[PDB]
Structures are given as structure tokens and as C-alpha cells.
Symmetry: D2
Subunit: 292 residues, 4 copies
């Protein structure tokens, strides 16, 4: 059974001066993340600007990240879209470049039913030998993957985990309860890392871990240790930093924050825009205020 650990990072996709994938910067980022508390990498997900990457770009990115990582942590590719046939095709291509797992989001835009999603996820999982992590995100796809649908899917051999960004730890609770011990529930919301783990989440699929991954591992350890005050103080930092990263559409703030701390990863592709000057000043003040 594959182990993504406590912090899977939803990695940004660095771009060069012309807006193309910057593989040199990607190498720097991957090595930084692994040395700063990242236990698995999600490549080409939402935070990696999957919507504006071509299929060819996605596969080149998956391949480069796999190569650099060199089996140090699991690499999860965001191959799932709202098109089942296309999702199968991309999943096959990611498998061919040696990723360890795939992330499959609830189809966005077309608003599928519970059974539609079941057949969607079932069809993609059957097409690959790789482990599958589901991704519930009604904040982006509108639909929810119901507890019962998640449970049914968990009975499929290679569907091993879920990123639950539904913002609701009570639905998380029920998923945790009604699925087997070898099915893992991750938070998809940085701010909920602590309370999600309190109810049985294995960890977090993170955006904030780009800049405070060490602090996050420290919080998780402290909680697991029973050091509630220590964990709570770091939780307060995590909430504050997370919030500053979502005042403009992600991933634009986290890319700018990385640049502020000496890891330039370029800008973003339309329809996303760079930060305004006012937005930048606000973010920098937050970044400067992180205890060092």
C-alpha cells in the first residue's frame, strides 16, 4: 500500500520569462519541497495550473518531476478531468513516465450525478495499475462526491485515498468511519489540517507547504504527541498564512510568495493574472512576519 505521508504538496508549475514550463526552476522547487517537509508531490493539479497546460506539457512535466524526485517521495499526477475518455488517455501517458499515482477530481462544469461519477472514477481506475486518489472539491466542481459514493469507490482495489476539500470534517468523519483502514482521507484545505487530523485524517494536500512546510510538520508532530498548545500556536500561523495565499485566485499568491523567499517560479497563465501592487504589498508583509 502506497504511503503519501502527512503532507502532499499541490505543486505549482514554474514558468519561464515566456510563460513556458521552466524545468530548471522545477528542479529547484522539487528539491526545496522534499527538504522542507513535503512527503508526496501532486504534479499538474489545480495549483499547478492544469487548466492552461496542454496534454503534452502535462506529460513533460510529470516526466521531469518523476526524474528529479528519483523515488524519494511518491509523485501523484493530476490526470483526471471532466472527460472520462480523456482522463483514461492522460492516465495511461502518466503511467508510462513512471508516476506513482494519479489524482482524479470530481468532474467540473458538467455536473455529473453520483452514479455518473462512480462510473467515471471506476472506468479510469480500471484502466491503470496505479493507485488512485479521489478529489472532492465542490468549491470548484459544484457537485460533491457523496459519502456513499466514496465508500463504494474505496472497495475498488486501486482507489486508495481521497483529498477532501469539501470544507466539512463531519462528512470526512463518516468517510473515515465507513472505509477500511487502508483507505486514507486527506484534508484538501490547509486551515483544516489540525481539526481534520483530530477526527482521523491522515494528513493534508497542501498549498501553504510551499512556504511553511517545516512549521506544518512541526504542528502535526505536536498534535500527534498530545502537545495541544504547541500545535494550536502553529495552527494559528497556518491559518494566517493560508488566508494570505487565497486573497487573489490561486496559485498566483503562492507563486509570488515563493519568489519573495528566493525561489522564483515565474508568473501565471491567463485567465489568471499577476498580483496588483497593492496585493503584493499585503502579501509581502505577511511573508516578512513569519517567525525565523
Amino acid at each position: 500500500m502506497i504511503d503519501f505521508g502527512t503532507i502532499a504538496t499541490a505543486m505549482v508549475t514554474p514558468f519561464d520569462i515566456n510563460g513556458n514550463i521552466d524545468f530548471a526552476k522545477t528542479t529547484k522547487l522539487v528539491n526545496y519541497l522534499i527538504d522542507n517537509g513535503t512527503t508526496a508531490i501532486v504534479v499538474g493539479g489545480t495549483t499547478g495550473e492544469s487548466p492552461t497546460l496542454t496534454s503534452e506539457e502535462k506529460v513533460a512535466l510529470y516526466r521531469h518531476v518523476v526524474s528529479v524526485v528519483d523515488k524519494r517521495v511518491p509523485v501523484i499526477a493530476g490526470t483526471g478531468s471532466n472527460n472520462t475518455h480523456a482522463s483514461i488517455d492522460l492516465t495511461k501517458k502518466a503511467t508510462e513516465v513512471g508516476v506513482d499515482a494519479v489524482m482524479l477530481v470530481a468532474p467540473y462544469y458538467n455536473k455529473p450525478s453520483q452514479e455518473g461519477m462512480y462510473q467515471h472514477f471506476k472506468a479510469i481506475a480500471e484502466s491503470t495499475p496505479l493507485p488512485v486518489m479521489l478529489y472532492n472539491v465542490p468549491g470548484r466542481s459544484i457537485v460533491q462526491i457523496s459519502v456513499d459514493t466514496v465508500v463504494r469507490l474505496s472497495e475498488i482495489e486501486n482507489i486508495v485515498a481521497i483529498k477532501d476539500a469539501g470544507g466539512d470534517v463531519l462528512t470526512m468523519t463518516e468517510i473515515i468511519e465507513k472505509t477500511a483502514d487502508d483507505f486514507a482521507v486527506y484534508s484538501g484545505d490547509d486551515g483544516l489540517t489540525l481539526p481534520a487530523m483530530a477526527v482521523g485524517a491522515k494528513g493534508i494536500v497542501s498549498v501553504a507547504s510551499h512556504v511553511i512546510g517545516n512549521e506544518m510538520q512541526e504542528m502535526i508532530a505536536a498534535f500527534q504527541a498530545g502537545e495541544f498548545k504547541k500545535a494550536q500556536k502553529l495552527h494559528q500561523l497556518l491559518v494566517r498564512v493560508t488566508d494570505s495565499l487565497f486573497m487573489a485566485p490561486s496559485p498566483t499568491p503562492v507563486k509570488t510568495a515563493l519568489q519573495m523567499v528566493g525561489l522564483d517560479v515565474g508568473s501565471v497563465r491567463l485567465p489568471l493574472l499577476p498580483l496588483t501592487e497593492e496585493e503584493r504589498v499585503t502579501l509581502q508583509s505577511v511573508m516578512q512576519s513569519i517567525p525565523r
Copy 2:
């Protein structure tokens, strides 16, 4: 200035037994719609299963529809996606096969800002000489195109209309109020056709027109002639029929309904599924209620 008329139909994409585009069934559907009150055709939009069509399929479909239509009504291509660069590419390709206008939806999944959407739509609109219709649909894209953003976009020469599927006639009111006379607001919700036209909407971008186009035409003629009683009775039918078409994910019910009235357009692509027998019989009862 292009005139889309009172009923633009969000056309389904007919498929054969194996899910491929059925060009012969498409020919029959196009002729049927034009003979049943459709004044413009939207090709390859949400109702046309845009998420599961490839770019090459879309273009092949636009080309075919252009041929069959033979300039009888305007042909609007659903070229907008959540990727600006890709949207410019597909818009160019549609222009080259002789479509008359393009539909650009608010980017789904990546949750752009108002300014992001402004630059997105501006970039696409400047890439083509064709008229552009905006498409507001928060129920699928999460984001709303704000009234102010729409007003700004209306000042761009070839941005001439908006399909507002926000379900709110008061926001439509304000758009109608704050834009020039040569900028048209369409309802994107069949049920709201009558009340939207009461506050100044030009017409409807319709799904229900696949099965009650003539009744809708009659209702609009009644309202425009001040015959409010006559319109209200047809309005009650339209609301009833429309609701029955969205009890399962669209466009599956309207495709099933078309088969019931002798126009087979096949089924749907995953992640969408055929109606269950329970769903079919529920739909059939409402279809049967249409006065003949």
C-alpha cells in the same frame, strides 16, 4: 449588427451507438429546430457536451452545422473554455469554418477574478472579427460575471450580447439598464424567459426549445403583443417541461425527450449516463402532458 432573434437553441450533439458524432442525425436535428421556432443555433456548448468533445470534433461539428444551416439562422460556436490561449485558438478555427459568432463562457474550475475574466474575454474578442456572446453561469463555473465587468465588456465593439444563466432577473435588469441599446441580454434559463423578457431581455438561449419551440414562440408573441393571460398559460407549460429536463444531468433528459417525439439523437458520453427506467417514466409523464 447580428440578430440572434428570440430563441437561440443550445443544440445537443447527436451521437451514434458508440458515442461518435452522428452527422446525419445532426442534419435532421438542425432542420427540425429551424422548422420549430429556433432563430439561432449554439453549437458545441454545454448542452452540446462540449466537455467531452475534442477540439477536432468541435470544429468538424461547427463546419457541418454551418453547411446544413446554409445561412438560414446565425450559427454560434461554443469556443470559450477556461484556458484563454486555447480559447483564442478554437475561436480562430471556428471563424475559419464560417460560423457567425462565438459563445464565451465564464472560466470554470480555476475561479478567475473579475479583472482576470475581463482580460480573458477582451483577449479572445480581439482575436476575431466575429460577434461575441458572453455566457454567465455561476451554477456551473462558480464565478459570476459581475454587472460592472459585463458593462466594461459591452464597450468592446464585437462583444454584443450575454447569455445570463445566473437565475436572477434583477442582475439582468441592471445589465440591461447600464449597457447600450445594441447590447442584448438573453436569459440562459428557460423558466425565466417570460419574466426576463418583461424586464428587457431580448430572448432566451434555450434547451426546452428542442421539444416545445413552437409553444415558446407562441408565448413570446403573446407577451410582446401585451397578451399576458395567453403568455402565462404557456409559461406554466414551459416551466413544467423545463424542470423535467433537469431532474437528471443535462443534456440526457432532452436527448431522451427528443427520442420520444421521433428525433433520435443517441445518448451521452461519460461522465454522463442514460436515464434509469425510473427517470425515463417520470420524464415521459411530463412529455405526455404537452397539449397536442
Copy 3:
């Protein structure tokens, strides 16, 4: 059958400098409304600050308004609360003072079921021979009176109308459709007056009628005569003025706007507060922009 006409006004309760009911100012307000397009008066409703009036003050207000109105327009008393027994008591008292009907709100705070609300409204309607208007207001009570529940209640002889502030003209449509001709549906949102009447609503229960009652009747007459450009212009005005009246908690804005047009009706009781200076400037600009 009782006829509330096209504009029932949710009348504010004038208070003197000590926060007590001002009887002279109430008389002035009543005569003003009757001379400015009001066809029925709702006394002691939400807009009349029912929550902060004592039981004794409510009945005194009912008494005074009945005596001043002198059968010129119907007087509707807001006797319903979230307590059925109390609602019966207050309804009987209002009946004895000689009001013409009672308004019964969906119970707030305690979140009753559909069947609970059915029994609530049935028990109150039972206690009086007077006509009863239901008041659906999920924006204050959270719960909705379902279409099916309204239809059942409409079958009770003296339940003759509903004020629907659900903000949904399509649920209104269904109520209009499924109830008898002698059961009236009123909009409970000033902005929706035009679109609601377009789908068969009899009129509006209004707040904006305190300040633009003539313009509202002008709009309704223009619509009914098929003068759509005129109606749409007045509609745009109604929407804009209405919105300005709800930027701070009602009824505080409309009380201030009355004073701006020379009807001082005093201030409000806690937990409501006077408008801030910023708020007063904002409202004043909207009020002085009304074309008269």
C-alpha cells in the same frame, strides 16, 4: 372576496422622540400612503418593527390605524409569530379591534416542518372569520412554505393570499398555477414586482411604496397597457431605490428616506440603530436621483 389591490404597503411605525408610538404622525403617514398609491395597509409587520412592539402597542396601533383608515383601504394586521398559541391570541385581539385581515409569517427561529407550519397556520386561521395572508420569508425565517403546503392551505376558506418574499418567481408561478383563481399571490420583494406580475402575481407587498408609490402604480399601469419601454424604465428605478432601502437593516433606511421627503416618522428601537453618517449620505444620493 377581499381585494388588497396592487400595492399593499408594509407600513413603518412612527415613533416620537422617546421611542413611543406617535399617533399624529401615524395618521399623517396613513393619509399620505392612501394618497400615494397604497391600496391596502399592513400594520405592525416586520417593517413596522413587530419584534420591538409590546402586545399592547400592537393592538393600539391596529386600533388607531383602523380608525384613521375608516374603511378606505383594507387594514391587514401582522398577528403571526413563531408561537402558535400567542398568534391565536393576537389574531383574536386584532379581529376584535376590526381589522380586515391578518398576515401570518412562517415561524422564524424554531425551524418548523412543512406539516408543523400547516397545523400552525390552520389553527390560527381557525381562530378568526377574517381573511388570512400567508407570508413566506426564508430570508428571515430560513424555512420555506413549500408550494404543496401553500396549495393545501389555500383550500382553507379564509386563507386567501400569500406574500411571497422567497425571491423566486418560478415558485410563485407554481403557486399561481396550482391554486384557485380566488387565491392571490403577491410578491414580497419590491424589485420583483414587474417580473412577478408578468407571471401572474396580483401585486406587491411593498416597502418602497413609502417613497415611490406613485411611480410604482405608474409602472404597473404601463406594463398592463403593453407600454414596455416605460414600464422597464420605472422598473429599473424601483430596483435601484429598493436596494438603497436595504443596505442597512430595514426599516431604518425607509424611515430616514421618509424624513428626507418631509414625513418624519422618528427612529428605530434596539437592536436596530439609526443610520451612520456615511449610510445617510449614500441613501440621500439615491433619493435625490429619483426623477419626479
Copy 4:
């Protein structure tokens, strides 16, 4: 500083066969709760059917509960309504019969502003020497007490705690962080007890404690000890049991569940109704699944 402990209970109000307060059943219930993990009693709150109790009933109920409790745990009276003047009156009356604190809910129905609520709570608190617990319940009152408003109120000497039923452990996090050590945040939802405590909440104001108080006590002891496996096991039970208690309008399910385990506390007052036989069977099957 008053200490409400980890499990305050929102006590139901027992009624006799005529729907009047049953004082003997109240005595039985109070003693039961105290022997089953309850550390503070909230009297005459929402769960105690405050909307349908007269002021005279409330005061008699407070007085009796004060008598039976005999200083073993704090008695908190639900004196706050949506009328500030009335809330001061009832607060005085509760103070006079010897309660230990009062609970003040966000005004429902009239939708006050943040500053309105600030002045409301400030004025009531000023009127009594007793400690005050605020009650945030947007699910019943619509409005929220913002974090900022809660922080400002926490600076008032006798405002010492908040029951937060907003359902959001991240707003709780911020309140906890920004208020002094002597200001306590309680979850207002049973299911959130564990995740709320994980971020620094003192405890829960509970409904489920009527039936599984001992289980919740063991859950909290396990959690505070850092035995998360057992805490998570009991958390799962708490969530399950709690959900079943809100499938019909509370408090009707918890009263019925109490009757099912031999503590008959009677029925409910209109607009609330007894459970149907179907609702009763559904509740019974969940209650019967509680381990004994």
C-alpha cells in the same frame, strides 16, 4: 471566573399531558444530566422551546432548576431575544431567581447589523452583574456575530464565553486567538466538539448529552489524554447519534429519545409536532445501535 466545564447541556423543557411545564419530570431530568456528564445546564434556550414559553413560565422554570441544581453545576438562563428592552427585563428576572449566568442569542428575524448586535449585547450585559455567554447561531438567526464583534464584546467584563453554532472551526480559531485567556469558546454543534477542542475550544454546549453524555465524557477524556484512536471511535458515535436527533425539528427527536430510554419529558408545543410513527421508527433504529 465562572467555569461551565466541558459539557454544558441545552436542556429540554419537560411538558405534561396538557403541554404545561412538568416540574417533577424537570427534577428527574436535571438529576439525570448531572449524573451523566453534564457540567452546566442551559435553561429555557432554543432546545428548551423558549419561543413557546411565556415570560412567566421561563422565570418559574429558571427558579425550579436553580432549586434542584442546588449549586452543583452552573445554571445558565436563555434570556436573550430579538428585542433588547424585553431581553433586559427577562435578564433582571432571571438574576433575581438566582441563576448563575445568562445566554444571549444573536437576534433572529429582524436581521440586525454588527453594530446593532454590539449595542444589543452591551446593553443587556450592563443590566446584570451575572456572567454572559453569547450564542452565535446563523442557522436560526441568519446573521452571524462576526469575529470582530465577538472580540469587542469579550472586552466587556461580564461577557465571558460564546456558544458558536456557526459550524466553522476556523472562525472559532480566530475568536480563540484574538480574545483573552479568560474568554471561552464552546462549540454549539455536537459533531464539532472534537475538532473545535483541537483548535482550542473549551468544550460543547450539547444536545446529544441528553442520551450519550457518558460517551461524550469518555471521548473528551480520551482526547485530552491524547488517545486519538478511542476519541475518534466515540466521535463517530457522537456524529451519528447527533444527526439522528436533527432529522426532524429539534428538540422533538431528543425528547422522544429520552422517552425511549425511560425518561419521559412529554411532547412539544406548536408550531412543533410529535414525531410521526415513521420518524419514531427511524430514530429508534439509531438509538438501538448505541452500544450498551
